[PDB]
Amino acid sequence: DLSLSDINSTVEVPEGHSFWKTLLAYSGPGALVAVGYMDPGNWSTSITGGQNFQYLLLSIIVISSLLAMLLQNMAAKLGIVCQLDLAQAIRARTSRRLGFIFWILTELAIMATDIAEVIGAAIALYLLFKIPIFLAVVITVLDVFLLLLLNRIGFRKIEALVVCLIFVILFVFLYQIILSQPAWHQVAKGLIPSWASVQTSPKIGGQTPLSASLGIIGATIMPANLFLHSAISQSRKIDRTDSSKVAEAVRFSNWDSNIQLSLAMVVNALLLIMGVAVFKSGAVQDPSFFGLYQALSNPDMVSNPVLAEAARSGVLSTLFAVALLASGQNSTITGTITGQVIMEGFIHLRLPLWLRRLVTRLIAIIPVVVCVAITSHQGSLDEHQALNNLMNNSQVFLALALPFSIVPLLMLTDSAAQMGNQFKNTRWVKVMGWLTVIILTLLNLISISSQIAGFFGDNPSSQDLLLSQVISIGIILAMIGLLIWTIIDIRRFT
């Protein structure tokens, strides 16, 4: 009846004021959440953002990360104080049909992330081991056994294995930056919140600073990782009777989460400066993983003789594909954990980790093998580009499931009927939190129409455009109705 019954309140190791060892104990949840923010689903969009705007967008990254650190922390609080996840809170404060709508929506979000991870991992196999594109996918389907071995390890070593992947993809991209020797002064100048990123005048590669910036801000959080954080934050036993120990617990999970999401921010920065210093200006014409592989393997694309010799040897591209693999392993862990959370929390369905990863991976790979089937039927022409367009079109479910995850979180944590007058949010995080939630909801409701119109490709059929407008209006209005309904129920609780 409690979230993550297998590992809930497992190891509590606060030992007086020995703070840093205590920090070493529970440092896992923050890493498990942060590794999701390093998925390849936006890698290109960083590199592109670097080529179109050298170091300019870095600040935006920071801001985004900060916002992601805010809401995530809030989720952790809801897990630490209430001893229950966000899905159990929402489902407890609303009917079953709304918990079922939220269930299918979040299932579609983690399914989209899973599509990104299976595409990036399969392509990673096509690049490293030269496995055929169709075989690499059905090889990625075999991650259920890696989940079986994953199940016997334990969170003290699982949550450190996630750290291992994090520093794998962090040192892979940091190594290619170390060889690049970039002008770190311009990097520092880019990290400052300037007003050149909010303008619309450069328009390089069909992208203005305000468009790229608002895109980075819009994709700030992932809805599944909020439920994830609220569930894994409970894995540390708390008496819930000593205010100093629960306040300490909040400081604990906060410093952990910021320590890891800061690493994710560093990875995004390494991708932007990867697009600025490593690649030449405008050398990246194919945002696909294969386009970045050959672009990292062509000496004329880099801007340094050392990177030309190393690229001719073929080490940059291979490291890139290794990073693709290490990123593609995340959805096997966090996808199953979060899927269990939303499942047994929203619809009260107890399912094992076997059929979970089976069903999610199959539903994820169906459109992938359909895309590879059509493109390989066209002669393997534009197959990687179509895989990239599938990966980017999948991300609409995140925008569909975002407000129903950030609004109920902010409401339930701001109310004293869930946190109490002692552990509710400060008047500071009330303003910052409501501002961020409004901005993200507006931006994603804007993104719905753009992605739905993007489903029809770059060929604008005049009759299909109006249909995309009708479908977009219907979807955003339906999300408005669901949003005001959830607002009404939660505010009836408070």
Author numbering: 13 to 506
Verbatim from the authors:
conserved and function as secondary active transporters. transport proteins that include the amino acid transporter LeuT18. μM range and that metal ion transport is coupled to the cotransport of protons. of the prokaryotic SLC11 transporter EcoDMT.
